[PDB]
Amino acid sequence: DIHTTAGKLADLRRRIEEATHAGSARAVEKQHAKGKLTARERIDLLLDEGSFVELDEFARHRSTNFGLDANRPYGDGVVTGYGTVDGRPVAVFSQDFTVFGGALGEVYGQKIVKVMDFALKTGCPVVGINDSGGARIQEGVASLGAYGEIFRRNTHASGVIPQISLVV
């Protein structure tokens, strides 16, 4: 059912699958064709096995500009969370090119800010895996605000916690 506890657990299992496969099957094919890996495969390579804990997995954008609200994929274009590398704490975000071409949006941006605040708060390195066609134009200035908030954090965290940019 759905009004039952067991039903709610099954419903979540379904959302996980959808969230874990936000980009279409062909988009992933195109990505692999180019000789690139997916956002998640990249995290799997970097982090110690099973140490990854995803954040905002079910985040969705709040825009209605240019019918963009027709598609609100879970995660909103970027995979974020924490784990460990060689047993040491690391915060990470990985942009998903298969979703809206990886265009940075408001919620997409806040997800990154969250991973950055977590890293400054706990004192661990931040590894950013970049792969984005640019700003998500449909969102206008909201896209600009998100970038600015990231730049500010980059600056404040400068020389505090290591920041490594992986541009693939």
Added chain:
Amino acid sequence: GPCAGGAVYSPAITDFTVMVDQTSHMFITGPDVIKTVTGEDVGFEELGGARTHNSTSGVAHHMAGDEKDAVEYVKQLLSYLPSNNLSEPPAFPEEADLAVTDEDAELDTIVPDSANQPYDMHSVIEHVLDDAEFFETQPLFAPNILTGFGRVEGRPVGIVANQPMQFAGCLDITASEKAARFVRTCDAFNVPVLTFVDVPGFLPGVDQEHDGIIRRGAKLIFAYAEATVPLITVITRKAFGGAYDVMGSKHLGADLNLAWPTAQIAVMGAQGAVNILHRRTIADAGDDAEATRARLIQEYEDALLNPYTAAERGYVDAVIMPSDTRRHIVRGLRQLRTKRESLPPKKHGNIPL
């Protein structure tokens, strides 16, 4: 033994007070003066015995059957705390096995289908703590909320959790002050705080307003917003209105906020919401005034009484399987234990009193 007159204020300022049933008594004014002044007849025991101060006044944190037990209780209390605020609580590190066990699995079915049916929150708490050991404080006071200590991978943690079995787990004046002082205690002594949420809202009542729930209930939010120790919160089921903000919400500074599929995070109940949202709509067509109301209600709850709207905003960091709660707390505390945060410089705050 006795603690009378102004002497009572010393233990009151201390962090924990443990009494022995029928041996100890605390009161500012004794029976004799109370009678020759108010004409009331009250005995020591009723006036301020161990049971009275552990379940009514809220001044004692434990009532023991004898002195040996009382001593054992303080030794325990001392084992979860550092020697001073300069260091982290004493720890005997031991890696945990994160493979999902049969006990972990029990959490997937602990929440009944009916939203009104209760379950024992003690079970949830024990399933995440080392050896399922939960050292409870103030058990007899404001039973609607649970406070106490435990260990996660050998490291002490404090717990704050609504108890569905008592007064439906509502928040009220007593539960607010009980938990508020406990939270500040853990924070002051560097003890991480884990909070589990299942709160329908605040206990309705003229008495709660007149007794000052406005300023008294505020102490709990202040406690949480002030805390700089790791804060991990798990919403198992209900989280409505202000009570949601109050129960270790991310908005107050909580570091990690998790919710079960069974969580219902919303401004208010479906009925009350539609009566306001669809007043005019429902008003139209007196003919069938009510099945449409019933329809709006069913629709409202199916759309908003879950944790997903909150998850879309990042209010909760993740919606998880109940069986994976122990996993999330273990791994969260590993990364959150290096948390460093400071408040604005001040001599001290001005928490409502």
Added chain:
Amino acid sequence: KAARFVRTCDAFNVPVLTFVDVPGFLPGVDQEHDGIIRRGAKLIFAYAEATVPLITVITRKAFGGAYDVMGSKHLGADLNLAWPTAQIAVMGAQGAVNILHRRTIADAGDDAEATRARLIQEYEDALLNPYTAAERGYVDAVIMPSDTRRHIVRGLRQLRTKRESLPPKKHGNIPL
């Protein structure tokens, strides 16, 4: 009511002047049950916590713990003044004699009463004043009621440069 106010003044650097004429705490089962033990303790905490200048003037009564609570020097008050009419003692005359002279009153049961009436009179004339407190320095001076403004003005002039600090901590754990 007072604890919060004192804490507000302290936090914002406002000196605190306190006037004392307190018989004790209100008797009643309801006060005990409603947590007088943990809620009245808030006032002593606020005063012991304060670092702003503190000047206290005892105009009349100051008995038992109430005396400690109302900005006594023991809590950290800087200047403590008492008028000639101040009565600083552990408890009322009748209560005290009934305990200290229990046997004396017992003996000579015949006309037991004007015997205690005398003890009470003698006790109040000997202890119900601010002079024993002044002997220990609990009050810095017993002053003429008319010289109160003068003392406060001159005290604040000196005390305004007061620099004190508590032990390092994230914050205190005031009873709630």
Added chain:
Amino acid sequence: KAARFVRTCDAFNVPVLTFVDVPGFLPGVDQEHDGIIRRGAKLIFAYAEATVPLITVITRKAFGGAYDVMGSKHLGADLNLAWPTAQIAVMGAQGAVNILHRRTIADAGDDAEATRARLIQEYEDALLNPYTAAERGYVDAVIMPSDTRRHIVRGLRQLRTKRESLPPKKHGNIPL
């Protein structure tokens, strides 16, 4: 040039006023090959790092990254003002619709062009202004140009007591 100036002002406690009218970054293979990515970053770093009062006024053009770079609120600017003539948007109308309406324009190929022309017109009339930014609070106010001096004078009076700190570090690692 500006990055060094901003850092100099901040280091010696001088408030910084910035007036914006930037179309974007100068296009050219040279700029890229010469490291505009790491060098243009210095200006954003200087602004994000400053703790002195920062007041910004957008008189006209503010597009894309350049908008973020010119003392934007997202970087920490305290007070952000915009004139009615301001144009705060991700990119120019032409390039935007060329991406947002690539299919709409394609369809009805016959007479494809006054369709994109209509869209361009609609796009600039709805977005190329400072009101979307104002709705989000990215600018604290859209003001009459004549009231700029008044806003800066009153802003500085309040902002001059600004106190803000950065995370402890030996120093930052600004791109060189």
